[PDB]
Amino acid sequence: IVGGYTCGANTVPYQVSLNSGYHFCGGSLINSQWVVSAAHCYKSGIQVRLGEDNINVVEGNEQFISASKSIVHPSYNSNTLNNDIMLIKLKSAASLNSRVASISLPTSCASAGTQCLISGWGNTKSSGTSYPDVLKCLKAPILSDSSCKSAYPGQITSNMFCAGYLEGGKDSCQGDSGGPVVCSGKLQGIVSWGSGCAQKNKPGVYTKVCNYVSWIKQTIASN
């Protein structure tokens, strides 16, 4: 997250870190057994880390649970990032508590102009590289479809939305991928892509989670 703030330990209790020997992507806990992340975060051999603040210090509220299964969306296209969503099943259910908690899936799609909370352990620099150890947060508004398509002509599908600031300076970034965009208390987006981070006229692009609720629900009813 570039231009964000330190969230505060365990104030984003649905945020997970996906670990394959190192943090590589975020995700969102949607119930005690399942995480939503980005399909482009797929790796074999994923451990889900819940209850994290500093991902490099065991502070005492973590749960580390291996994935048993990952399910990339059936229509994921890694070239365009259309349908950039994945489900990860935990080997064992998380113990839900004040620090480890699920986020609701949406009923309705979020509205342009809504300010959402985006969070992660990704890079904090637009030019260059610095990865934080503690979780960072950003409030960013959803942009209109027309503005999103202007920013990325021929690239935006109906399964994506933009959020952020066209002046630059505030955005998600590498290593935030797969993490949550929460709007009105529901998971509305997944950190997916963008041109660089926090560059002028190049806002973040997010997987539109409200288009996937029926897939998510049928898949978790079946696995």
According to CB under 5 A, which residues from 137 to 166 bind Ca ion?
A: none
Buried/exposed 59-68: b ≥16 CB within 10 Å, e otherwise: eebbbebebe
According to CB under 5 A, which residues from 94 to 123 bind Ca ion?
A: none
Q: Which is nearer to Ca ion, 59 or 167 (CB)?
A: 59
What is the bridge-based pairing of β-strands 15-19 and 47-50? antiparallel
Annotated binding site for substrate: 171-172, 174-175, 177
Q: Is 133 a catalytic residue?
A: no
Q: Does 52 bind Ca ion (CB under 5 A)?
A: yes
Between CA 48 and CA 18 the distance in angstroms is 5
Residue 150: in which H helix or E strand, if any? helix 145-151
Piece in contact with Ca ion (CB under 5 A), picked from 5-13, 30-38, 59-67, 146-154: 59-67
Between CA 78 and CA 42 the distance in angstroms is 11
**In the complex, minimum distance from the CB of residue 86 to Ca ion, in angstroms, rounded to a whole number:** 23
Q: Is 177 a catalytic residue?
A: yes
Piece in contact with Ca ion (CB under 5 A), picked from 33-41, 56-64, 89-97, 201-209: 56-64
Q: Does 171 bind Ca ion (CB under 5 A)?
A: no
Annotated binding site: 52, 54, 57, 62, 171-172, 174-175, 177
Residues in the chain, overall count = 223
Q: Of 17, 28, 37, 177, which residue is the catalytic one?
A: 177
**Cα torsion at 16, 19, 24, 29 (round to 10°)?**
-20
Q: Which is nearer to Ca ion, 55 or 86 (CB)?
A: 55
Q: Does 63 bind Ca ion (CB under 5 A)?
A: no
**Closest Cα to residue 12, out of 134, 142, 191?**
134
Return the residue matching tokens 């296209």: 77
Residue 213: other Cβ atoms inside 10 A:
16
Piece in contact with Ca ion (CB under 5 A), picked from 47-55, 84-92, 140-148, 186-194: 47-55
Q: Which is nearer to Ca ion, 41 or 55 (CB)?
A: 55
Q: Which residues bind Ca ion (CB under 5 A)?
A: 52, 54, 59
